[PDB]
């Protein structure tokens, strides 16, 4: 019969849809998992969707995924109360079976599920407490602590008076009665958390607003024969904006940094005033650009902007990357606009930070000395840079740092003799030719 | 103005001993609505 045939693969595919959704259920995937789950006929696969939750819980690979699982149930209980209505039933009997079985591993699996569901208002506080009365009627203490660690936060909010009575009997356990040792230390840890207020039993996937979960708080008691509806998981036979072309927010910020920068006496004062403002990290690249441009209005290099920039870098590492990003942004882009009076300010400015290791020598590797990838004003910037390296460090100490720098831009060694003839001709034009002793040995071998 | 400036205050007991550096700032001139009045030391290029 083709109708039994059609319904069976329909029953199969629904069963083969729910099981990979539950096996892929995780936090930040809950909403996409629930969406796809909604389009499959949940109501026809009523016990199928329940049993796939129960078995994925029980398996003991999970337990970790229990709050992810319980959050889906509250979504389902919000959407269809009957789904959570049936699913809360099976978890009661699974507890009652394994408590009677004394399967301590499987009990705690169910109890973590029942705890979180109470955290997600699926089930009533009543059904929780009576389990607690049964467990505390025997010892059962390994089970009951994992319950109260996760649920006692919400439970003391809702049912404080009876909950306090649970603690008072629980407190009578430790002090006036003798207990096995390993169990006992776990019991007093609960007391410790109790002063600590439960702040590590109160984190999970509260996706649903308290009015977006339709409040089907199922009031079922673990003393109610619960109809154990395994049968619906069998197969059957249904005969059934304004665009911003202006930057006036930036200009009022660009004025405020300039007014800080002119109202100070020393560079340590202007540095503290810029660190007082607590500038956000997207603007700290722009604050360096206001400092450099205001250093070019000065018409002469100043030690003010150096010791300003030194206290920026040693404060936090995000200022140090901001000067590293600006030194590349100045050399590769901004050299074409700058006059030769402004380039002697910058080369002495960047020459000062490099000679005192506020910027590394590896930032000089970006600069390349060729005929092609060189500017006539860029060679002027290199000239005033190396002079501040010579005057501060000396000619021997600068020789040591350039050998440790292993750069290829200033120093071509692998070949291309027209570039070696270029760089010797450029460095001797600066007035520093003692460093070109390596290249002239490389040049005459090529000849 | 030359006095709307944070004045460096650094540990007068130990500032006579060594050069401490600028560790703290004293306020220079006080006003209800905060104005950062510039000072001419930023406008006069130094001798060096």
């Amino acid at each position: 019969d083709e109708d039994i045939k059609f319904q069976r693969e329909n029953w199969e595919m629904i069963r083969s849809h729910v099981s990979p959704i539950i096996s892929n259920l995780t936090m930040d995937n809950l909403q996409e998992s629930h969406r796809d789950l909604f389009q499959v006929n949940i109501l026809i696969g009523r016990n199928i969707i329940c049993k796939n939750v129960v078995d994925f819980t029980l398996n003991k690979q999970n337990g970790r995924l229990i709050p992810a699982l319980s959050a889906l149930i509250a979504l389902l209980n919000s959407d269809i109360p009957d789904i959570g209505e049936t699913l809360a039933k099976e978890l009661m009997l699974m507890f009652v079976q394994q408590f009677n079985r004394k399967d301590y591993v499987s009990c705690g699996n169910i109890l973590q599920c029942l705890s979180i569901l109470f955290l997600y208002d699926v089930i009533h506080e009543i059904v929780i407490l009576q389990i607690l009365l049964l467990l505390l009627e025997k010892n059962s203490l390994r089970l009951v602590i994992a319950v109260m660690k996760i649920c006692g936060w919400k439970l003391a909010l809702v049912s404080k008076k009876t909950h306090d009575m649970i603690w008072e009997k629980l407190r009578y356990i430790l002090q006036t009665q003798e207990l096995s040792s390993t169990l006992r230390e776990s019991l007093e840890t609960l007391f410790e958390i109790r002063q600590k207020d439960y702040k590590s039993g109160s984190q999970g996937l509260f996706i649903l607003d308290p009015t977006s979960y339709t409040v089907h708080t199922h009031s079922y008691i673990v003393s109610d024969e619960d109809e154990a509806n395994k049968e619906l998981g069998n197969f059957e036979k249904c005969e059934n904006q304004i665009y911003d072309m202006t930057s006036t927010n930036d200009v009022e910020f660009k004025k405020k940094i300039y007014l800080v920068l002119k109202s100070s006496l020393s560079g340590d004062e202007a540095a503290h005033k810029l660190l007082k403002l607590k500038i956000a990290n997207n603007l700290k690249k722009s604050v360096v650009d206001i400092i450099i441009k205001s250093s070019l209005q000065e018409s002469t290099f100043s030690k003010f902007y150096s010791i300003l920039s030194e206290r920026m870098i040693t404060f936090h590492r995000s200022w140090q990357t901001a000067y590293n990003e600006t030194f590349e942004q100045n050399y590769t882009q901004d050299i074409e606009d700058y006059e030769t009076d402004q380039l002697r300010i910058l080369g002495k400015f960047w020459g000062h930070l490099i000679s005192y290791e506020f910027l590394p020598m590896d930032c000089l590797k970006i600069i390349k000395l060729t005929e092609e990838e060189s500017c006539p004003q860029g060679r002027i910037f290199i000239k005033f840079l190396f002079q501040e390296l010579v005057n501060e460090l000396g000619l021997d100490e600068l020789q040591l740092r350039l050998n440790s720098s292993k750069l290829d831009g200033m120093f071509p060694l692998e070949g291309d003799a027209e570039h070696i003839r270029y760089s010797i001709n450029f460095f001797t034009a600066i007035g520093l030719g003692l460093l070109t002793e390596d290249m002239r040995s490389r040049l005459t071998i090529i000849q | 103005s030359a006095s709307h400036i944070l004045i460096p205050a650094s540990d007068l007991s130990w500032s006579k001993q060594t050069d401490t550096g600028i560790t703290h700032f004293r306020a220079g001139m006080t006003h209800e609505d905060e104005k950062l009045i510039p000072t001419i030391f930023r406008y006069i290029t130094t001798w060096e």
Binding site: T314 | D11, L12, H24, R26, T30
Partner: peptide
């Protein structure tokens, strides 16, 4: 707190005596 820094008083100083730590001097 008055950890050796600041003024004996702000009466004859013609300032407020407000001391704030230099965020620039750290290391």
């Amino acid at each position: 707190s008055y950890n050796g820094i600041g003024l004996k008083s702000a009466k004859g100083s013609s300032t407020s005596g407000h001391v704030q730590r230099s965020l620039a001097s750290n290391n």
